[PDB]
């Protein structure tokens, strides 16, 4: 009974739960029982911006001049590299302003929407964002949390490897299942590691 | 074996602020005075 | 255009906060509770579930109060250390939100709720009612 | 008569939508280097 | 679990009865193997017509008396715990409610001086016991909660050593008798009781073969 | 690798007139 | 096999014999009463119906008590004097028997029942309760 | 992790109770294997109707007294430590706060003369204790942080030896009872407590077989 | 908006002369329509306030 097909819902809500756990692991997974992610291993060279003196207080900051110097510094001898970041950060860059009030990008369009795949940015809004979701960062004072993460960049095809051994599988668990109740069992086997971690880089505050 | 199930009768709103980068300052200007 | 939803799922009071009540569930085939609090609770409260049987003196009045056994499905791991079904309203249930639940197997003709010992002074701030389903006769 | 007779004589029109409202997130598993493997501990 | 193989009455093979040790509060189980006696009497084996009897050969009568009360369902019950211990000398009284033998469907708020209140569990009708202890002397106090109509009977004040009403069984296929032997928490260490067992066999036609044996229960502390 | 700074050029304009 | 029907037709208390309780009927779109007697009545018992509004200060607490008007449907000849809804539990209604009525046109967001004056003596033996039908969240 | 195989009540194989050595501060685990007693009683194994009781046979009553305070969230709490050491003879008071047994969700700084300040961690409400040591003698100081609304109840001043509230278990497949045995940091070395266990098996139809044992807990320093 | 708020269409308006009540000296018309809507799922929408 139960007109709504429940089994196909769980088989759907297991590949989904697995998909985001795997994506979450390869980033910040900690050693034992989950692959060592490249955010926590922290052997990518890391660059950090220096603060600015808003009326003599030295709040942390991150302005467009920092982004251009961070992405062009990548030695082109490693190959072509893509940058990943949280979409609020890209919103942060797009809303900057020069001293007179103009926008630094799209000098009057109500919107800055550039070709991302022609800029190698690959927004994925699960990463950590320094805007604390939103409603933090980019202040005169009382925001922006020194020491935070902003974005990354690497020749990913060789700076981090993903290992797959056996894809997701489902099977009726004969035993523990009787003539009136079924017990299903699913599983998959995979892992990941860093390649050579002189191919990447990280930007901080 | 009871398994409860609870909903709220009146959901609440949720406000938030929209801080945006300040008009920048630049660290160190060349022509200046001590 | 709302219907006389009374018949075809009637409902009765099962615990008014001061005294319990047995509600007859013979005439119907499926039933469940709807917990609801009137003021903030202080700690997790636990109610016992009781089923009656038709009294020998008169088959239209409930007899003594037996306690309904507990049935695990597959996922059950707690088993409540007693094999006697019971509900437990968790802490942090604001008094504008209801909670539903029911036993997986009825037995007898009546059903009753009463606060288990220890949580008898918080149950004075809760209300438990029973709503049935289709009528067999 | 009507509006005072149970609620079972009126069968609602079961329409065929199913609201979801659940962002997964964003995929980041195609950048990395992919290598199929065999029995563990390579 | 105790086990006694009974003598087959063939004119072949300190005290008379076998020995059974017991501990105050325990409820154990006993097996008897009538095989050696009933197997030669080829018939329809044993029949569930066994009768027991308990006698006291050393009693040391109880110091503190037992008592009984009543209350309706849901209603709290309060009573005294001092008029039950007539003391011969003049000394103090340190009342106590043994936690291992507290009530089973309520709580008891033992006051400071032989006073207590018994709040019966919600929606509960039956009998309920708890074993107090005055100056080390143990006696039970029985409370019967009535279902608000009329009344329940007056239970029989369980003996120091008892065999329950019906928990016995006879396996006619292996000629083995089992029963339960429970010892009250009010048993006094050192006392000795005597349990005599009268077991009846049956022939193919429907006559009887009786057989009598005895056992000596010795109430010892620490098993 | 230890966190290295990313010092970029400031507002550099002038080379011939000191400010009063 | 009984269903946990507390969700999808929950039920709440409206008159436990001593106090009325506003029941929020906004989140749902159909509702009804299921009266029930606890002991024999003395004469006809009359109840008033009230509907509330979201309070002026707080939008999730009921406002004052406003008396809901009543509407006919091509056959009303009683036509209550002041055109205000009311329900009359008829005399000679035994226990173990429930009557179920419902106001046709809904208004406000909290509804309530109160014992009409001159009938609050034997109104302590009734226990009204409400059951909604279908969440619209 | 101690392990006791209980007597089989078969009339067959210094003091009565078995021994348990415990050191002040530890929280250990205990196993008991009722297999030899309940396996012949073919039923449904054990049940989670076990009860524990702790009695003292030697106490050497404490020297320092305990103390209980009250405070709300975020608000600093102040208190003294000099009215807690009733000294029959005259001696100096070397106040010390053991770094091991300090508070859990706060921080204290010891004054020079019976002074201390408990500044609770921000955004924390509950009950927090910490064990002081006046001149070698140990006590506890229990403070509750209230969520500024009304008030909190009274905690029960943890005993020298306790068995935690609900951490018992039992596996009816192998007839093993597991429970936790915890010792307060104030238990005085040389003392002896007695722990009693009433474990109840069950036959096929729901009746009961009771079994009682005891254990002698001796609070000794250095294991 | 295609999945944040829904509009439900059932029947357009109509118009017909109410016979009973319209004498040979007066006349009375009568009209009405039936429609509605609801809010689908308010996690697909924002609001900018001051």
Residue numbers in the entry:
A (entry chain h7): 260 to 464
B (entry chain g): 1 to 34
C (entry chain m5), G (entry chain l5): 1 to 137
D (entry chain h7): 166 to 207
E (entry chain V3), H (entry chain U3): 1 to 13, 21 to 230
F (entry chain f7): 10 to 29
I (entry chain g7): 415 to 464
Cite, word for word, the article reporting this structure.
The tail to capsid junction involves a symmetry mismatch that is bridged by the neck, and is therefore crucial for the assembly of tailed phage. The extensive network of disulfide bonds within and between neck, collar, capsid and tail provides an exceptional structural stability to Milano.
The 5-fold symmetrized map was used to build the model of the neck-capsid junction — the neck 1 and collar interacting with the 5-fold capsid vertex. The peripheral ring of neck 1 breaks the C12 symmetry of the core and connects the neck to the capsid. Five out of 12 gp14 β-sandwich domains (n, n + 2, n + 5, n + 7, n + 10, CCW direction looking from the capsid side) display pseudo-5-fold symmetry. These domains are covalently linked to the MCP (gp9) by two disulfide bonds, gp14Cys117– gp9Cys252 and gp14Cys120– gp9Cys440, which emanate from a head joining loop of the β-sandwich domains. The head joining loops of the remaining seven gp14 protomers are not resolved in our maps and thus likely to be disordered.
